[PDB]
Each structure stands twice: as C-alpha cells, then as structure tokens.
Symmetry: D4
Subunit: 160 residues, 8 copies
C-alpha cells in the first residue's frame, strides 16, 4: 500500500492506544507510517515532520498525546494537511487534560478531535479512511464493508 | 456545493454563521440549513442518506446540550462529518462537547472547539480536505494562513 | 410485553440486566434487545416507530459515552422513554449522563442515575407508570418498597 | 381536573418552574403550583407527598437548586411518579442540583430532566406523555405540540432568513 | 454518656463511618451508630432527628453518598448541629455526595467535611471540638490527640527513614 | 460579649461575609469581624488563632476564595471550632475555594458550608447551633429564626 | 536592562498580561512584551525561544488561552525558566488554559500560576524572586512590595 | 552545599517527592528532604520558611495533597521562590491538590507543576534552571539531561518491536 497516513505519538507509552489506530488502517488497506515524535522533547523533529509531510506524499496525519497535549496542534500549525487528534488517557485526570489541550484550538488552526483513548484512536483511522475514500476506490470499498459488517454484527446478536 | 452546513435550530446561527463566512472567503460552495435531530428526525436521516449523491463532500453539523445531530448524521453517511459544539447557556458547552466527541469506536465525528472558534475551524478543516482536488481552494487557504500569520507579525508590541 | 428494554451494545448488559431483573420480580412483561443508534440507525427508527402498535407502554434505553440512543428513540415515539446512563471507562459516565439528560425543550428523556442504580430505578419508575392501570403491579411495587424499608429497619446496627 | 402537582423549594424557582406550568396550560392539563420547601417546611413536604394520590394527583413535578432534596424526598413518600427539574443555581450553574436529583441510589427513582427552563418544559411534556394513555384530549394536545415543533423547522429551513 | 448520634444511609457506608466511631471511642466520647435511610426509611429518619435533643444527643454525624440527602433532611428536623460526611460514591468518587451535602441554601446548615474516611475522622474530631466546651475530659482528650499527631511528625522528619 | 470571630482574607470578601455578620446581629450574638490574610499577614493570622480561646471566642468563621487557606491554617492553630465559607471566585465560581477548604486531611477539621452568601448565612446559623447549648437566649433566637422561615413559606404557598 | 520577556498568543491577551508588565515596572525590572502566537507564528515562536538567552533574557513569561501551547513550546526550546499564565477563556473560564499549561509530562517544566490576572501579577512577582539573587535593587523592591501589601492589611482590619 | 529544600506534608507523599530528589541527585544539586506538615506542625512550618534563606536555601519545593496549603503558606513566609507539587489524592485524582496550590491570589506566588510524579520531576528540573546561572556544572548537567531525553526519542522512532 502507498504511504498516505502518518501516525505519530508523543512517547512510546502511547503505543498501547495508537496501535488500535494502526490496526484499523491495516485492515482497510491504508498505507501508513508510524513514528514517535515528541512535541516537548523533539520539537525540531516535530516541525520537520510536519513541514515535509505533504511533499512526502502523506494526505492525513493522526497525532496522539496526553496530559498537556500539544503535538496535534503544533503539527497542524506547520502543515496544511488535515490533522486528527487522539487524546490519550492520562493516568491522573483520565484524559480530560488531553481532550481540552487538543480540542480547544482557537480559530485559524484546526485539529479534528476524537474520543479519549482507544475509541478515538480507532475513530481517527476510520475518519482518515473517509477522507481518502473520495480519491481511492479500494479504500472506499473497504470502508463500506467495515460499516456493513459492524451493522451486521449487531443485527445478528440482538439478545444480550 | 461541496459542504453542507447544518444545525439543530436557528438559535445556533450566531455560532454557525462564522463557519459560513469562512467558506465564502475561501470560495467554497456550500448550503446551510436547520436540520433538527430531535424535531425533524426523518429529514435528518434523508439529508444524511442523500448528501453524497447530491455531491456533498463534507458535512459540518452544530448542536448544543445533548448534541446528537453530528453523531446521528455520521451514522447515516460515509462522508466525513465535522462536529461543532454550540455553547449551551447552562453548562458553557461542556455537555455539547462530550455529547459530540465521545463517539465510541465505529462511527467517527471530527470535533472542534466549543462555539465560534470550532465553527471557524470546521470551515477551515473542510478546506484542508477539499484542497487536495481543487487548486483555487489550495491557493485560498494558503493565503488565509499567510494573512493570519502576517497579521500577528505586523503587530508585535501590543502596547 | 409492556416495557421495551434496549441498549446500544452487549457490553451494556452487565448494567441493563439489573433493570430486567426488577421487571421480572414485579411481574412486568418486557423484552430486552441490543439496538444501536450509531451502528443500526434504521433498526432503531423502526423499533421506536412500531413500539406503540406492538403493545409497549414504556421504553428503557441505556447507552454510554456519546449516548444518543434514548434521545433519538424519544424523537421517534410518543411513548415515555427512560434513559439509563451507562458507566463509561474513561469519564465514569459523566459523558453518558450529560448526553442523555440535557435534551432541549420539545422531546423529553426521563434520566436516572449513572450505572446500575439508574438501571434498577428505571425499572421501578416504569412500574410506577404502569401501576395506574393494573392492581397486581401496584401491589408488587408497594411490596418491593415495603421489603426495602423492612431490610433497613430490621438491620439498624452496622456493627 | 387537577392531575399534576408542580412544586418548588422557593419562589426564586418560579422563573424556571413557570415555564413548566405554561406548557401544562397550553396542553390543557390541570395542575396546581405550590411552594413546598424540603428544608424549611419538611412536615408540609411529607404531608403533600403522602396525600397526593388520594387528592387525585397522578404525577408530581418538583424543582429545586443547590443541594436539591425536594424531588427525592417527595419520591420517598409517594408511589406516584416524580419528575425532578434541576434549577440553575447562581454558583455552579445547576451542576450541584443535577447531581443532587439524578444520582438517586436504587430503590426510590426520580425522573430527571435538563438543568433550567429546558428541563421545566420537558418535565411538563413528559407528564403529558404519561397522562395521555388515559386522556384523549391530552394525547391530541401533545401530538399537536410535536407536529407544530416539527412544522416550524421544516418551514424555516434557511437560517439566513 | 451518649452525646453523639452517628447515622448513615446504608450498611455499605460502614467502612467509612466506622473510622468516625473509632475516633469517638479513642476520645472517650459516648455515641450510638445506626443505619437510617432518608429515602427508604424517611419516617424513622424524621423520628430520629425529632427526638435527638430530648434523648440527650448534642451532635449528629450523618454520612451518605450519591444524591446524599440524609445530612440535610436531619438538619431540617433538629436544632442540633449536624455534621455531614460525603461517602465516596463508586461512579463519581463522591463529587455527587459532596455537592448534595455542602450546597445547602441559607436557613438550614450542614457542616461538611472531606469526601470519604478523611471527612469521617474529621467529623468526629469536630464533634469533640463542640463538646469540649462543657466536657473537661473531652477537652483533655482532644488536646492530647492533637499533641500526639504533632509529635508523630516531629519524630519522623526524614522521609527516607526505613 | 464577643463569642464569634468573623475573619476573611481580604476586604473584597465583605460583600459575602457581611451576610454572616448580619445574621449574627439578628440572633443577638456578639462578634468581631476582621480582615486577616493567610498569605499577606501570616503572623497576624497565627496570633489571632493562638489567642482566640484566651480572648473569649467560642467559634471562628473564616471566609476565603481561590486557593483558600485561611480556614484550614486557623484550625491548625486553635482547638476552637472553625467554620469555613468558600467565597465565590471570579474565575472558577468558587470550585477552587470549596475544594481548598473542605478537603482537609484527617487531623484538623474545618466545617465547610456552601459557596458564597448561602454558606456565609449558614456558618452564622451553625455558630448559633453551637452556642445555644450553653446560652438559653441564643437557643430561643435560633428557634424563632427557624419558626419565622418555616412560617414565611407556609404563609406564601402560591408563587405567582 | 531587559531580563524578562513577556509574550502572549494574541493582542486580546493584553488585558490580562498588562498586569504582569505593570508589576515589573513597579519593581524596576526591565522587560519586553511581544505577541508570539504558537499556532499562527510557530517559526517566530521557535526563534524567540532560541535566541532569548543570548539576548540576555533570564526569564520568559508566556500567556495563552484555550488549547494553550505557547508556554510549553517555548520551554521546549530554551533552558531559561518559563512561567505560564493561563488566560481566562470565554467558554470554559480558563480550565482548558490551566490544564493545557500545567499538565506538562516529566522533562520540560512550566511554572504555572493562577487563571487570569491573579496569575499575571504573580508571574511577575515570581520572576522577581528568581532575579533577586542576582540584583540587590530587585531584591529590595520585592521586599518592599511585600512589606506594603502586608502593612495595607494590618492598617485596614475593619472591612465595613 | 544544600541549595534546595524539598518538603512535603506527610510521609504518604514520599512516593511522589522521591522522584524530585532523584533528579536533584542526578544533576549534582545539593538538597535536603523533610516532612513538614502545614496542618499538624504549623510552627515548624513557619520556622522552616523563616530560616530558609539564612540556612543557604535558594529554592523550596513543597508537595501536598487534598486541601494543599503547604506550598502557599511557605511562600507567604519566605522571599525565596517556592515550587508547588500537587500530590495525587485518592478521592479527586489531585484536582483538589492542583486548585489548592495554583489558584494563589495576587501578592504571593507559587510556581505550580503537574499533578503527581511528573510535577515532582519537573519541580526539580525547574529548580535547576533557576540555579544553572550559578554553577557551570549545574548548567552542563541540565543541558545533558535534556539531550539525553531527546536522544531517547530520536534514536527509538518506531514504537513497534
Ligand atoms: O466541584 C466539583 C468536583 O468536586 C465539580 O464542580 C462538579 O461539578 C463535577 O463533578 C462535574 O459534574 P458533571 O459535569 O458530571 O455534572
Ligand atoms: O472536561 C470536562 C467535562 O467534565 C471539564 O470541563 C474539565 O474542566 C475537568 O477536568 C475539570 O478540571 P479542573 O477542575 O481540574 O480544572
Ligand atoms: Cl497557545
């Protein structure tokens, strides 16, 4: 698969959330790369990643971070590509800090924000597919089939 | 007409007008409509079912309180849906924000800041989806960002 | 079958089972079913539409996170809908609660406690609705209350 | 006939609770409205709840703010359905009242609506939905209300008007 | 002699409320402890509150969680000072308990303490500070409790101790 | 004869704490009211607390907002009952004030009342409930105030 | 001599940050103030942080609201102490600003003060306490500021 | 030479504040660690803050939880910089700790860091940034600490294994 989505995260500890993103991208046939890019510890690398993403052929960036979560916003500041933000569940405040740090962007620089934790990691991937589908038949198909199968799974198991 | 801007009531217009203003400035075609998830549920379903074949590429949906409009629209279209939490009078949009962003795995809504900020940013995010296949939008967005940057650099000492 | 007990997903069963248990204890006919607002939106609309003609008098709906199921069922039936916020793993049901209870004026949802307490109480409130027309349910509910009172008066010493 | 009791802790709740009464007025439902304080008139409170059923009330709608105990205590003392409206406190924007009403432990339910006027209105509309089952006038009036709110959106689609 | 009434909505509050009683014991203060539910035994709760003063009680400590109404409804039915302990609720970690107790409007006070066992302990120590004014031995015991807690920290300054 | 000390961290707390003092005046209870800052006058605050019992005070009522330390630090320096009134902060509507006062660890209690003027009123009424035991005049005036407020609601049942 | 850089995300933050500047003036501390937007002028922000030490700045005070990333991103790019002032957001009363600034994971600290003008004033006062070691005039001026504020409460005990 | 005083309200804070001291050790900064309770040892508290400067301290790092008053009260009684660490509380996950420390009114500042271990570590690292001007060895050690944390991310980009 050609490499269309960049999945980045603040530290290695985030993997247990962001893998669930990568797993879905994999299931949908979507080419991606994943990298640890810290906004606070590797600020220059973060700018360089953001700046070059479009000319490296990426179409969407999914960024995950926790606590004072700046990674998605600062990446969005340095690329015109759509940036999707995953608030990672923080051990002290259960991701309330993550969520507000990402979602409350003032006007001018957007970050599309999804649910705290794994659910938003999964949804970021599916939203990335809904971006890439307009341009890519197999990804359009794969997303259609995912939705059809999740719908079937609930229709087939009505008795709890 | 590539963007559908919708909201639960006319009371949301003071917020969503700002979304529309940015789409105009960027030369992006849009329609704007009151579509209530609770009071016009059948029209909400129809709207969402037919958006793609009507040629819409993104839907931007605002709602406050128990804000169900974005999520229910996303349930019924594969187009990307952008959720704007409208500031509630009682809880300052905290209800709006959680009701929109906390979608469980399977049906995503891209959520932006509470109020006017999220409205603008939704228009600007839709621009970044649409630039990929239209160079007039790429020009217009580049320029928008160029100008907002220039604006800040022109006024450095606030005294 | 007078009470429809529904939920967004199977994971909600550990909560919603306690609702059904109460209805059993009180001799109230019910059905329980997984109906997803986001994954089976058409089925949902259908369930809500046909509920009255199928004989249901009340619908009890549980959901967690961005909890849209009760509001949307309420939008599509004239029957009273009771909302149970299910405890979400990240925000302890704060999101579920606000997503259910903060309905704007026009379409109500009667909301109960987050978690098991709300599930049990939904079932009891449905009994309080249905007692008006059936003496056996009135007796059952009066007995349940008497039992819970006796349980505390007879066990006054925590030591 | 007087089928719904609308009660509240204090007259300062009236600006919220009046919106509940105006909706019952419009649906042609008979009600009484009354200040009954859980904290300042606890005995009258118990009395009101105790006698509601014999007085012919079918539903009680109770509003309060702060440490809002009125809905839960009435519910403790009557088998009638009680609806709880969290009144917007000046300090925490009704978050205290919401939790105080909605977080009832298993055994004594209170049907809880939205903080403030939205909940007040919805409380009334929800009382209509309980009462409709045995009052054709009420079934009619509630269907006309929902038809109207639906029509109003369909006929005014363009917010730029 | 029985001067403090310790009450709570349910037996599941005992793991918290037991800590209150332990302190009352240590300070030599007479008390009774009883489950009295505002929602399931509202009439017994009125009865308890009503009769407290004429039964010789001087303070009531009430614990409850969730939509915690016990402390405030007791306070509405007695002239005695009532101390409220918010019990840590499973769902909202006692945030519901705390607001349902402390946010009483003007007219009927409930002195409120910290969520959970910290508040249970402090409710007892606070009742001791009410009673000390007319009870010499309780004054003595409270002085000594405070002296001993100060000494414990003075004797253990180095957190690396092992 | 002065039995209640009413203190507060700054003059701006007066619009709240005046309501405490006004109830004390109506119940016939002697008090003094003083600006005592935990952060700007810590030595005076220690001294006030240390000498309160000696000066004849039976109860201290302390208001503060924000990072509200006055009630708790006074309680640390007297064995008298200390009543805390969280004053409504401009930024967080008294949430910071409430948590700063009520969440005392075991060992040093502060009796905490509602945020703002309702808490100020109730601290006074609660001080009365402590003082009534040893003073029949305070017991009578408190009893009347409750009978008054009950009768007012009872006599005005129609809110219109 | 310019030792403190006072920066803010936008002109609208000046209503808050002016109070910081006013206290620096009173303390006789040289400072500069500049609008530096993390999200709209990211390159300028990296340059400001990078060049601060060589320009002779000793402390940076950064104000921001919403998803407030300015203080954290400046701190990532300079080893100077960075003080963060959460600006009161119109929507969430600065709760988002506060969590966005204070919740920095281990590695890159930001010293955080109160939401709003309280924090703006205290950041100035705290910058003075860092600088006082290095300058006897700043040390005396801080000493006096405190002496005055203390005296002001001792001389004015009656709140009525 | 002891330049930083690390204090805490009780022994149950050590699991957090130990992480602050570890970092001071790694940076070669002299410090002392002490249990000083604002509520149980208020006099010792005042004396500790009073004498800080004359005993050679340049910065105080104070940790506390719940109604966390230690950091603010020490700042009211010394002219030295005080750093505040919110200790995670069992009931409210350090939300009380944070607000009790950070929301200091104008006049007496406390520099506040993240709730818990993250904040304890960052207190240490912020203290080092105050003191680096003073000792070229401390500036070297802080510069190296940062380099090391950056290297760990730049050299380990793929989180997969
Ligand atoms: O003081 C607190 C917590 O001690 C907060 O003000 C509460 O309001 C919080 O529990 C949120 O509640 P909801 O958002 O669930 O209503
Ligand atoms: O996300 C929510 C919704 O429940 C809140 O708005 C946060 O603000 C909360 O985490 C409180 O934060 P503090 O009270 O710790 O500032
Ligand atoms: Cl920023």
């Amino acid at each position: 698969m050609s490499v269309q989505v960049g999945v980045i995260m603040g530290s290695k500890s985030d993997w247990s959330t962001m893998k669930e993103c990568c797993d879905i991208l994999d299931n949908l046939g979507i080419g991606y790369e994943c990298e640890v890019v810290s906004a606070h510890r590797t600020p220059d690398k973060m700018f360089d990643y953001a700046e070059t993403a479009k000319e490296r052929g990426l179409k969407v960036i999914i960024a995950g971070a926790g606590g004072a979560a700046h990674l998605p916003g600062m990446v969005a500041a340095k690329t015109t590509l759509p940036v999707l933000g995953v608030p990672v569940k923080s051990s002290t405040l259960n991701g309330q800090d993550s969520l507000l740090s990402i979602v409350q962007m003032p006007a001018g620089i957007p970050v599309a924000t999804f649910a705290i934790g794994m659910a938003g990691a999964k949804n970021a991937a599916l939203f990335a597919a809904s971006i890439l589908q307009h341009t890519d038949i197999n990804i359009a198909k794969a997303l259609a089939e995912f939705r059809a199968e999740q719908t079937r799974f609930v229709l087939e198991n009505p008795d709890p």
